[PDB]
Amino acid sequence: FVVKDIHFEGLQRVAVGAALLSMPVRTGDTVNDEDISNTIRALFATGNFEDVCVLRDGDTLLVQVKERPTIASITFSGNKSVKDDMLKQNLEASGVRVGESLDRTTIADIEKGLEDFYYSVGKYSASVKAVVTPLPRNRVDLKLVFQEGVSAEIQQINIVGNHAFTTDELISHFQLRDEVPWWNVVGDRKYQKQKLAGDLETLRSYYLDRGYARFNIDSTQVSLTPDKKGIYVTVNITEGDQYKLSGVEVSGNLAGHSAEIEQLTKIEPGELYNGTKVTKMEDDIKKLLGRYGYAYPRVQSMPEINDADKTVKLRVNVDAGNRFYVRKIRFEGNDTSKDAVLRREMRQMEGAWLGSDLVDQGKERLNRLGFFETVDTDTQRVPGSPDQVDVVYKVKERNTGSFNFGIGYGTESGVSFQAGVQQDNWLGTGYAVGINGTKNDYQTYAELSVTNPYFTVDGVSLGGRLFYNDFQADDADLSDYTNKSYGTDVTLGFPINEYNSLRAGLGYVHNSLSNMQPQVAMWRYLYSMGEHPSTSDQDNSFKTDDFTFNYGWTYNKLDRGYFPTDGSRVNLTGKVTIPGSDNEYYKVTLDTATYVPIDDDHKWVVLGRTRWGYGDGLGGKEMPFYENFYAGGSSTVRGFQSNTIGPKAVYFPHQASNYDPDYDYECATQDGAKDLCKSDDAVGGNAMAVASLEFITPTPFISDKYANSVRTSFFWDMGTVWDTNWDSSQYSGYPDYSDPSNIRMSAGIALQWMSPLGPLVFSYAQPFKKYDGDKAEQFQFNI
Amino acid sequence: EVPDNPPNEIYATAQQKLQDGNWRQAITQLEALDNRYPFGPYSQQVQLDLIYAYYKNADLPLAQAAIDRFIRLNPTHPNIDYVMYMRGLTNMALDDSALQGFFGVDRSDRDPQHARAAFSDFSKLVRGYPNSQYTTDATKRLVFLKDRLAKYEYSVAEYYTERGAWVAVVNRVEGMLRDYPDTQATRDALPLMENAYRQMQMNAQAEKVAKIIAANSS
Amino acid sequence: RVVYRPDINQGNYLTANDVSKIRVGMTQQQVAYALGTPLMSDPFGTNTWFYVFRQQPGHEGVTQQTLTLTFNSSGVLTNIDNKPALSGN
Amino acid sequence: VDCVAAVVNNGVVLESDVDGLMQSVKLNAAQARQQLPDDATLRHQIMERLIMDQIILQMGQKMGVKISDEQLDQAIANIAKQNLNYNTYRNQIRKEMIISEVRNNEVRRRITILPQEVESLAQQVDRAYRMLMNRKFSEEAASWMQEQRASAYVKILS
Amino acid sequence: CSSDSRYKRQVSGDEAYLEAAPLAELHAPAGMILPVTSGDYAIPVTNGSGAVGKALDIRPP
Amino acid sequence: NSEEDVVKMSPLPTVENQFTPTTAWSTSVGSGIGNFYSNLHPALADNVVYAADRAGLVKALNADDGKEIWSVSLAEKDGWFSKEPALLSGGVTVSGGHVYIGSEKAQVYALNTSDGTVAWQTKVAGEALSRPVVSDGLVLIHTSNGQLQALNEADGAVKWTVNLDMPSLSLRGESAPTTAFGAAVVGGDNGRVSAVLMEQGQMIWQQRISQATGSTEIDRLSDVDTTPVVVNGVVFALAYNGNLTALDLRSGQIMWKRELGSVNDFIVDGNRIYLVDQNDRVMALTIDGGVTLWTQSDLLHRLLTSPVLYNGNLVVGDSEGYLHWINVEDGRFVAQQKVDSSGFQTEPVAADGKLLIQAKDGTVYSITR
């Protein structure tokens, strides 16, 4: 009949007129009394409703609506192998997430999906149950209950159908494990469905590259024990027969470079048909075509076989394409470091033909810089002209500023501290700046350095360094070992090729030291300088000004800039005094770090570190003692202490030397002073040699999301320091420090983590081969 | 984490905290009210309050997500222009985020993706609702954004001139003329293109650029 | 000198065999098929196509090959200029 | 007045259809000495029928299998020589034909006749082949219906 | 030390964009066409009659 | 490690020993079945026992003494190693003057009983995991690929290779066929019982019984891996996931089905079918209509073996080693007997007024009153 109005009881998801957008009644016509059914069908088919009830008890249309509830919270429990992070993404992908409506179809879909995943991994006695608890004001809560029963243990892998290879040899290389060694915990026996396909492909390639061509896998089964405990994987093969490569021929729209393709395609006659060799040939053809510009070549290799004479004649069809050009190079993610410090690392120049190798090499150079965590390349073709393409680099800038605060000693010295900051990427400008200063009742020290890697746009890098160390024994400047030292350094370096650098520079430093303790090495140095001071009284003064010309070489082919995973680095630094300086000496230092990977994933890495060092004087003038090397602590032989490896000073009889307070300053003073006495104070020699071997392994309590920020290493470490000059007479009753065979050694574990304060290393070190005056330490924390 | 209370008082305490400004505490109350009362009488007000609180809390990703959520369910509303304005403000404020203001470093050649993402927003705003009360600020920020993008392209062109890749210089400056013609950066950049032609022995192509620079010297 | 200078390439490269294919008469599309989209083109007035093939070996003579094509305002070639450059500097 | 009888998959089942079918199919055979059960159980009988008719109907749209109007015209011409509102009758027939057709589409595809039991039936009793096809159709259709009833959402609203 | 100016109804960014130079379009030199008539980044001519900078009281109204 | 959360309920029955059973003898054929699922079991022939293991060892034994007669090792002499395991997995079947043994490396051996020599050793496509069935001068093997192959009894001579289907999650242990009136009835890993004319190798009828209308078809395997048994013109069958069926032998018409199904081995007395569910519920049914006469569900997840009707008692093993004796009517734990801690998962067999069982390690036992 006639309807006056339309009234509803659904108020949340239904709009004002969006409801009426579907009904045909229009409140302005007589009702057929049957089309109401069609109206309800359409309304519920809109998908925004759950129950619809039309009433015309009076003279109007009342549509009782039961809107679908809006999910308000997500609870799930009993799951072990499916973590929340992936489950949330899986639920969100299928269009269910908190805040939107619920559809009963998606519930069944999610149950099926999760049960499918468990059947894939192996929890065959598993079933997720999703139940919705109603909540007032028409809401629901979704609950998931997981019966993760148990993974079935794969029992045996059978390769019946082989007649040239033993089963064990074949099943050794499979990613799945037949039997785990008894006395090992190397692996497991879970059946991952993807690993099955991986191993089937592995077997196919294995027979395919030892010669057998007419080889194929008939059928693979996955039996199951009638208890859902064991899985018996079976593979059937057609062994086939061996073959030889009769001759490989190339054809197609090959570009003008046919000579190099022919040279690549040459193979010594008589070889066995190898599939991986064919893939290698195709890949290198693609690379050689890419280097000239054809970045998208179609290469198809067909092994036409003659099964009557053990012969295959591979046909290689090549279609190069067009010489692509890069239209523009864009950078994304460099939110701090300005655009220049990316565009200057490139080797694929803008507005040129696409050199498919130059892009990858530029990506390598960007990665090596040391201040990008993840750098990824993406060559995407522009949707217009046939041959244009944009190379887009996506970077994620990482922290690159190292901080260092702390205290000189626990006793209340007073406003005495140590500070530090080193920025590799100061405000992203590219400059490397570093400043630190420690003031203490023992010493006062302050240094600064600024380096610009690209003073001009070729690589010519310019740097300067200043320092001030007039510590004068801040405890007291009277009758104390006083040393005011300072100088300046300026260097610049240029590259020779893509993996080298040479630096040269100048500097001058002067040292004024007064009231020195008497001991053998220092007095030898003073005798060399042309000084003949006394021993018991300590009032001598020495001022020396040195003008040093210094040089260095740097080879850096390293896959990453922050605990890398592959490559090599060598760093040589030397200095020579120029004529006219007070001291005539020369010093040479060499550093080397080599990272070799053993696994495709680049997670287990062998690290070989080594350092060598030799310094001496020229023209009968000894090398100054204050330039002596050291060892120990971190960054060297780790496990003893910083600067405690090598010679120990032998004090002359010290007595009545200016002021000697009682119960302090007891270096060698004694009323019954006998003779020279051995001590434990380290002075450093002029021959340095340290080596270290590290096994780098993943940390066993971390996910991949944080895997690149923590590194764990097991190190065996060795090192030794000794003096090139010696006295048989003055060291008759004391160990001969000139002998370089007294090698200190240690081993231990190291933890490395990159914190917002900078990189941190925690190490636990056990020494093995020690000597006197080591005071070895087991824990070492450093920044 | 909130006591169960009738709607009026929980909204009142949320607004009181917002008057105070403790956004870390106001967002909790707003989220609780919205989650408990999804499609109530005044869910729109809760959504807009979430936008304001998220923005002033420097919580840019969630503010962006809430803007992009609300832009759909209410395509027409007397405050949709406000939502677009805050979308643009979110993008642009997200761009200029670092310490470099303290030290005074001209952020011009950093990533421009945020700048363009904001320009699209403010263009939509000034094109759709030209009589609103936010339009003049949008216009000024549009001028600033165009100047900034032109400066970025100019920086790339200048580096390529220094490096020696001339064709890059020519293409970049031609693009700057094509897209950002009325700014001051492209006026600064014309001499680079003139030199790029001259160094390639293209007198018949550098003469015209010399004429243009001469004409617009003023 | 001594400072390492990476190899620099600055435009589309055209081989003499492909150059011989182009003569007066063909439309734009056939030229694009022959040589590819020109990397540099004129924005001012007459639509002229520049093909500049320029190379810097690095501490060696910069080499340049210029091909200037003038297309009349209908879509067909009018004249060409195949300059080996190497003039003056 | 109007209410929803049941929900299926994405479609719906109306009170109107079950209410009409409850009596509209039982009155004709009452004169043929038919003793139907009580209303309640027969209602669930019709419920089980209708819930499946729907599933088949949405299945036909899932696949995208249609029937031309000409087949309807020829079939109603057949009905003219064989034996609501006119358009309602035609809308009923349009879906009824596809609901019936999906059964014969699936069964013939999943049936398997080996030419061996035909000889056994011929020796026991061209009629044998027809008997075999009828039996195999019946069994496979029952199995298919049973498995389809399992993989579709359903609820009871009474 | 202290927060922004009342940190309410005040934009989080600075007011440094108001110093932006006004836009002056290039004019066409003698007998030669410019490519400038190819833009996409157009600024529709909008009047004043509104607040600016720190005076734009942002509030969910 | 932390994920081992299995759901199961394995209780031990009430101690009720109404009579004492005792062990006649043992042999210790050696490490045999072990952890691997298989179908090895001895068989009787003229007061002799023939036993085997997975190492290739084959032994002959006498009754009441266990005194060894002959024994050979079938190590892979033909190969590179001459010591590779032969992987005997087929059940031991004695017939006439031969003992047929299957292998998982696609080999079938026919040993020559007392002498111990090999009559012939042939290769059949795919793994052979079934009981070799002897019939009418032929051997039937159900390889684990769906290929039912028939061999000449005298020597090899593959006659026909009937093809079946193989869904890719079938549970292990393919069924061995039953021969009657020139027809071999064989189950397949796809849920369908098929009859093959056993004179050329031509199919007669292939009928489906496994109605696994499960929500998750991926795990509703629904294969048949029990030997169908024939009484008069009606043959019975059991899918893994349900639908016990009694169906006509002449055609593919189902006489009647029962929803319990879900079995891997069963026995028929000619009037009362006894069987074991997946859940180790031992029950009996009437052949006439399938009325569940009686049930016993005290056990659950004990992983039983096939029942054996010996002296009116249904004897059955379990995983922990106990042998359980069930009354012929209504069920009752008439006697328990612990005879080995090694374990049971093969099939006990009894005939000729005896009883024989094989554990996973201790191998042959004879269980007697």
From Swiss-Prot, chain A:
Outcome recorded upon mutating residue 370 to C: No effect. Lethal
Gene Ontology CC, one term: cell outer membrane
Database matches in InterPro entries: Bac_surfAg_D15, BamA/TamA_POTRA, D15-like, OM_assembly_BamA, POTRA
Domain named POTRA: residues: 1-68, 69-149, 152-240, 243-321, 324-398
Impact noted for substituting residue 441 to L: Very minor growth defect
Pfam family, one: POTRA
Assembly notes: Part of the Bam complex, which is composed of the outer membrane protein BamA, and four lipoproteins BamB, BamC, BamD and BamE. BamA interacts directly with BamB and the BamCDE subcomplex. The Bam complex has the shape of a hat, with the BamA beta-barrel crown in the outer membrane and the periplasmic brim formed by the BamA POTRA domains and the 4 lipoproteins.
Domain notes from UniProt: Contains 5 N-terminal periplasmic polypeptide transport-associated (POTRA) domains which interact with other subunits of the complex, may recruit substrates from the periplasm into the outer membrane and also act as a chaperone. The C-terminal region forms a discontinuous 16-stranded beta-barrel transmembrane region. The central pore is ellipsoid, and probably closed by extracellular loop 6, perhaps with the aid of other loops.
PANTHER family the UniProt entry points to: OUTER MEMBRANE PROTEIN ASSEMBLY FACTOR BAMA, SORTING AND ASSEMBLY MACHINERY SAMM50 PROTEIN FAMILY MEMBER
Name recorded for this polypeptide: Outer membrane protein assembly factor BamA
Organism name: Escherichia coli (strain K12)
UniProtKB/Swiss-Prot annotation, chain B:
GO cellular component: Bam protein complex; cell outer membrane; membrane
Keyword Transferase: no
Bilayer topology annotation: Lipid-anchor
Top-rank taxon, per record: Bacteria
Alphabetical list of InterPro entries matching this protein: BamD, BamD-like, TPR-like_helical_dom_sf
GO biological process: Gram-negative-bacterium-type cell outer membrane assembly; protein insertion into membrane
Compartment list: Cell outer membrane
Entry keyword annotation includes Repeat: no
Keyword entries, A-Z: Cell outer membrane, Lipoprotein, Membrane, Palmitate, Signal
Pfam families for this protein: YfiO
Disruption phenotype: Depletion decreases the density of outer membrane proteins, but does not significantly affect transport of lipopolysaccharides to the outer membrane.
Principal location: membrane
Function per UniProt: Part of the outer membrane protein assembly complex (Bam), which is involved in assembly and insertion of beta-barrel proteins into the outer membrane. Constitutes, with BamA, the core component of the assembly machinery. Probably involved in transient protein interactions. Efficient substrate folding and insertion into the outer membrane requires all 5 subunits.
Free-text comment about domains: The N-terminal may interact with various proteins as a chaperone to assist in the folding and insertion of proteins into the outer membrane. The C-terminal region may serve as the link between BamA, BamC and BamE.
NCBIfam families: OM_YfiO, PRK10866.1
Family in the record: Belongs to the BamD family.
PANTHER family tied to this protein: OUTER MEMBRANE PROTEIN ASSEMBLY FACTOR BAMD (PTHR37423:SF1), SOLUBLE LYTIC MUREIN TRANSGLYCOSYLASE-RELATED (PTHR37423)
Descriptive protein name: Outer membrane protein assembly factor BamD
Gene: bamD
UniProtKB/Swiss-Prot annotation, chain E:
Subcellular localization: Cell outer membrane
Lipidation, N-palmitoyl cysteine type: 1
The species this protein was found in: Escherichia coli (strain K12)
Assembly notes: Part of the Bam complex, which is composed of the outer membrane protein BamA, and four lipoproteins BamB, BamC, BamD and BamE. Forms a subcomplex with BamD and BamE. The Bam complex has the shape of a hat, with the BamA beta-barrel crown in the outer membrane and the periplasmic brim formed by the BamA POTRA domains and the 4 lipoproteins.
Lipidated sites in chain (S-diacylglycerol cysteine): 1
Ranges in coiled-coil conformation: none
Family: Belongs to the BamC family.
Protein name: Outer membrane protein assembly factor BamC
UniProt note: domains: Contains two well-defined domains connected by a flexible linker. The C-terminal domain may serve as an important protein-binding surface for interaction with other Bam components or substrates. In addition, contains a long unstructured N-terminal region, which is required to stabilize the BamCD complex. Only the N-terminus of this protein is observed in the Bam complex in X-ray or EM structures, most of the protein must be highly mobile.
Curated annotation (Swiss-Prot), chain F:
Major location (coarse): membrane
Molecular functions (GO terms): identical protein binding
Protein function: Part of the outer membrane protein assembly complex (Bam), which is involved in assembly and insertion of beta-barrel proteins into the outer membrane. Nonessential member of the complex, which may orient the flexible periplasmic domain of BamA for interaction with other Bam components, chaperones and nascent outer membrane proteins. Efficient substrate folding and insertion into the outer membrane requires all 5 subunits.
Subunit organization: Part of the Bam complex, which is composed of the outer membrane protein BamA, and four lipoproteins BamB, BamC, BamD and BamE. Monomer. Interacts directly with BamA. The Bam complex has the shape of a hat, with the BamA beta-barrel crown in the outer membrane and the periplasmic brim formed by the BamA POTRA domains and the 4 lipoproteins.
GO biological process, one term: Gram-negative-bacterium-type cell outer membrane assembly
Similarity comment: Belongs to the BamB family.
Species this protein is from: Escherichia coli (strain K12)
Keyword terms: Cell outer membrane, Lipoprotein, Membrane, Palmitate, Signal
GO cellular component, one term: Bam protein complex
Topology in membrane: Lipid-anchor
PROSITE patterns: PROKAR_LIPOPROTEIN
Protein origin, superkingdom: Bacteria
Classification via InterPro entries: BamB (IPR017687), PQQ_b-propeller_rpt (IPR018391), PQQ_rpt_dom (IPR002372), Quinoprotein_ADH-like_sf (IPR011047), WD40/YVTN_repeat-like_dom_sf (IPR015943)
Protein's recorded name: Outer membrane protein assembly factor BamB
UniProt key word Glycosyltransferase: no
Pfam families given in the database record: PQQ_2
